[PDB]
């Protein structure tokens, strides 16, 4: 089988654990806990992946030509739509950034 170059962990995160987030514009936004749908309410939550802080890859990535390279695992983010409310208390669907991966970055030694 295979093996990741960087160790990651995923987790379900509710808007309740989250609270605030940054939108595609730079603004801090509050993420609403429930969204009104046809029948009733829908608890708002997200699936997040990030570099495992206690994984083997905590100091450099796995399989790296240490001769020519320095390396490092880092959590990268992506844009997901969410019902949110801004600073001017406006409610609406916005793209907010959430962790979705752990990737490896190299710098020439």
């Amino acid at each position: 089988g295979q093996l990741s170059v960087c160790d990651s962990i995923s987790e379900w995160v509710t808007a309740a654990d989250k609270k605030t987030a940054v939108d595609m514009s730079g603004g801090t936004v509050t993420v609403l806990e429930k969204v009104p749908v046809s029948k009733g309410q829908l608890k708002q939550y997200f699936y997040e992946t990030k570099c495992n802080p206690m994984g083997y890859t905590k100091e450099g990535c796995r399989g790296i030509d240490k001769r020519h390279w320095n390396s490092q695992c880092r959590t990268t983010q992506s844009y997901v739509r969410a019902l949110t409310m801004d600073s001017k208390k406006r409610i609406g669907w916005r793209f907010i950034r959430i962790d979705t991966s752990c990737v490896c970055t190299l710098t020439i030694k």
């Binding site: 093996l3 009104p36 699936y47 992506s78 844009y79 990737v103 190299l106 710098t107 020439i108």
Partner: protein
Amino acid sequence: RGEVSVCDSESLWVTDKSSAIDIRGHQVTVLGEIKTQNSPVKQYFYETRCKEARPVKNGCRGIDDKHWNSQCKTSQTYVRALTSENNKLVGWRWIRIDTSCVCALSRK
């Protein structure tokens, strides 16, 4: 200005998705719009996949091919989307969307 990634990638806004694989493993239809709240707002995703499976041609970049086999594979995450199945049961389901490009290592 000296950073380099083991694999390269591209991000794009995907506006005409009409099919996807959900958390159960079924093929479901992604609807084009979220009508309620009476707007109605279109449904689009921010996707990011691999430019290709090999930036260098041993696999991914920066690897120790002297004892490793690599490949850059697109990995997915789950995002809730309004969907339907066989044109029924319209609702919010967790679907898989390409979210990043990642290096897969194999021994020798």
